[PDB]
Structure 1
Amino acid sequence: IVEGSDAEIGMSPWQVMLFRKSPQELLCGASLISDRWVLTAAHCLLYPPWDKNFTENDLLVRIGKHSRTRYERNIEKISMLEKIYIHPRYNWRENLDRNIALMKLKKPVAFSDYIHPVCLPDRETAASLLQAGYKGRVTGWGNLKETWTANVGKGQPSVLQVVNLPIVERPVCKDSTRIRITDNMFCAGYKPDEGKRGDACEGDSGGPFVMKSPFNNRWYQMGIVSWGEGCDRDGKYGFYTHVFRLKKWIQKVIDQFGE
């Protein structure tokens, strides 16, 4: 997260860390949507050009984390995956279209002060909240800058980071890049000359862009951190999977396989 700040404890208790077994790496962010289901980006699990095609046994999910590197005993829970599900029309060769994935945990995770699921939007919530100029929140343990001077600057945050970003008009999104933007993408971030800054960055992928409804006080995941051309570059924007746009798939995966 570029130009964010340290999250308060329990601030984003649906935030999940995808953790690689050997070597031990942060893979991606992700989010808790029930006691057995975790939502993330597909390129977190399947990206052939980098020779990435993870099976269930290569990863862990870590839930209730605050510190990036600590094993936070009796706070975080570490779950094994039962099964990975990638959207069947996820397109990696061209533009990361339908960049969405679900993971089912072997066991249900117990909820706590630090571990609690986010809501997914119904139609009225998507229509109300997902409008240009309105701000959502992005969280992750990803990089603090796109590049920094090696072995000197701060690279990874010690603690989960949080940043608030405005949703950007669809025509401005498309004019900021040469990539074909689709239905199931939206973009967010400040314009140059808005003065303020901020972006998701490497290691934040798969994490949640969430919004709070003022009318029921609940947080809804409206987006998944999906892709960017750099981090925090002027006149560039972070792209996000439009979760509501793809909720029918989530429905298909969950009441054919799980809940």
Structure 2
Amino acid sequence: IVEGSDAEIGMSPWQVMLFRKSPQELLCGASLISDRWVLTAAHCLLYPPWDKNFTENDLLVRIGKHSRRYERNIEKISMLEKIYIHPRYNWRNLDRDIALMKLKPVAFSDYIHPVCLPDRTAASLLQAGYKGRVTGWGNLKETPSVLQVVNLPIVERPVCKDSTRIRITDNMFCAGYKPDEGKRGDACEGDSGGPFVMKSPFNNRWYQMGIVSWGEGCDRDGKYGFYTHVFRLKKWIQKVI
């Protein structure tokens, strides 16, 4: 994450990191939405132009981690039972870039806790200017030891569309500071799949509003990061769960 900061211990209990069995390598980030389901970005498992096609038997997850240091008696490993990519995943603008990985149930802890999925919250929290939080162990620059967090304000549809040449669909949204906003920050490579959360001032709960999908460069003036609009795809998630 560019211009981010160190996450405190137990700041994101739903934070999950996706690993590949062999070669054992960190692929993406993900969120724990329940004791047996993990949410991640579609391109983390499937992306044809890069001969990328992973399945439940080629991956594994690790929950409750702060540093990339064996957090003894805290972190938990798990194998996937099945994977589910959205039937209409347009990998040829990453439209509907979302997937669900089914785990045996993980034991909750002070460091392992599920995030809430948005409810018709969405209508209130999804407004330009409102800030959300991004987390990940991705690249600090375009070209870390511990988890990174960065609060970013959501940008309005027109600004998002004007900042790129990729056909922006309604199943996504951009976020980030404008070139004259003062502050900087943005997700980057490796942060793919990471959660975009917001704290509901109504019931004091954290809701995952989006998923890290794509972005031109990292923290470039004029550019903003695009996240999967979770709420809109909730129907699918509900059906497959």
Identify whether the pair has TM-score above 0.5, normalized to the shorter chain: yes
Give, in angstroms, the shift of residue 163 of structure 1: 0.2
Measure the CA separation in 2 of the matches of 1:172 and 1:126.
20
Measure the CA separation in 2 of the matches of 1:24 and 1:71.
15
Aligned partner of residue 236 in structure 2, secondary structure: helix
Give, in angstroms, the shift of residue 168 of structure 1: 0.1
- How many residue pairs were aligned? 240
Give, in angstroms, the shift of residue 71 of structure 1: 2.4
1:10-159 → structure 2 map (5 Å cutoff): 10-68=10-68, 70-93=69-92, 95-105=93-103, 107-123=104-120, 125-146=121-142, 157-159=144-146
Partner of residue 147 from structure 2, selected from 154, 157, 160: 160
Regions of 4+ moved over 2 Å: none
Give, in angstroms, the shift of residue 73 of structure 1: 2.1
Write the deviation string for residues 212-257 of structure 1: whole angstroms up to 9, x where unpaired: 0112110000000010111100000000000001000001111xxx
Measure the CA separation in 1 of the matches of 2:62 and 2:177.
31
Gaps of 5+ in 1: 147-156, 255-259
**Aligned residue number for residue 152 of structure 1:** none
Give, in angstroms, the shift of residue 20 of structure 1: 1.2
Write the deviation string for residues 67-92 of structure 1: whole angstroms up to 9, x where unpaired: 02x22221111010000000000011
Give, in angstroms, the shift of residue 110 of structure 1: 0.5
**Aligned residue number for residue 151 of structure 1:** none
Measure the CA separation in 2 of the matches of 1:78 and 1:184.
32
Aligned partner of residue 240 in structure 2, secondary structure: helix
Partner of residue 186 from structure 1, selected from 163, 173, 186: 173
Give, in angstroms, the shift of residue 24 of structure 1: 1.7
Measure the CA separation in 2 of the matches of 1:10 and 1:72.
12
Measure the CA separation in 2 of the matches of 1:42 and 1:112.
28
- Percentage identity across aligned positions? 100
Measure the CA separation in 2 of the matches of 1:131 and 1:226.
19
CA-atom RMSD in angstroms: 0.6
Measure the CA separation in 2 of the matches of 1:224 and 1:236.
17
Measure the CA separation in 2 of the matches of 1:71 and 1:60.
16
Write the deviation string for residues 181-218 of structure 1: whole angstroms up to 9, x where unpaired: 00110000000011100000001010100000112110
Gaps of 5+ in 2: none
